[PDB]
Design a protein around this ligand. Structure first.
Ligand SMILES: [Zn+2]
Length: 78
């Protein structure tokens, strides 16, 4: 149940990674395009294009990258 507004267009998961690297993609869609984010030269070319201007910036680094998820999330839905 939603109003009518700007009609979106068709797009491919090789291009959707653009929103992923910019930091503007939701966690549900991040798994859905993730299957195509597998080993693909056309994907890596689109990703590295963004790193060429977003990774460019000495002083910004990381040294602790832990991977942990909350238990209350993923509710009993179908
Ligand atoms: Zn691809």
């Amino acid at each position: 149940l939603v109003p009518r507004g700007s009609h979106m267009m068709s797009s491919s998961p090789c291009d959707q990674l653009q929103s992923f690297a910019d930091g503007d993609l939701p966690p549900m869609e991040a798994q859905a395009f993730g299957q195509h984010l597998a080993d693909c030269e056309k994907c890596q070319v689109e990703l590295t294009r963004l790193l060429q201007l977003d990774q460019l910036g000495r002083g910004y680094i990381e040294r602790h990258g832990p991977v942990d998820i909350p238990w209350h999330a993923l509710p009993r839905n179908r």
